[PDB]
Amino acid sequence: SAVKALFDYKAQREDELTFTKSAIIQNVEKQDGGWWRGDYGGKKQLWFPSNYVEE
């Protein structure tokens, strides 16, 4: 459900999260393809790279 960022990530497209290292991303929906959806920073269920986070 929640994950923690290992590195800063900056949204490159409208449908992506932006977060800083150590951030807690919530309500994570895992799927195939190396990107998951989650909640952070007022954005809901947007994409982020799964290799950016640990659980």
């Binding site: 590195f7 800063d8 990530y9 497209r13 190396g34 990107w35 790279p49 290799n51």
Partner: peptide, 10 residues
């Protein structure tokens, strides 16, 4: 040393 995001297709 940040990982490469798997590049997204159009």
């Amino acid at each position: 040393q940040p990982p490469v995001p798997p590049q997204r297709p159009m």
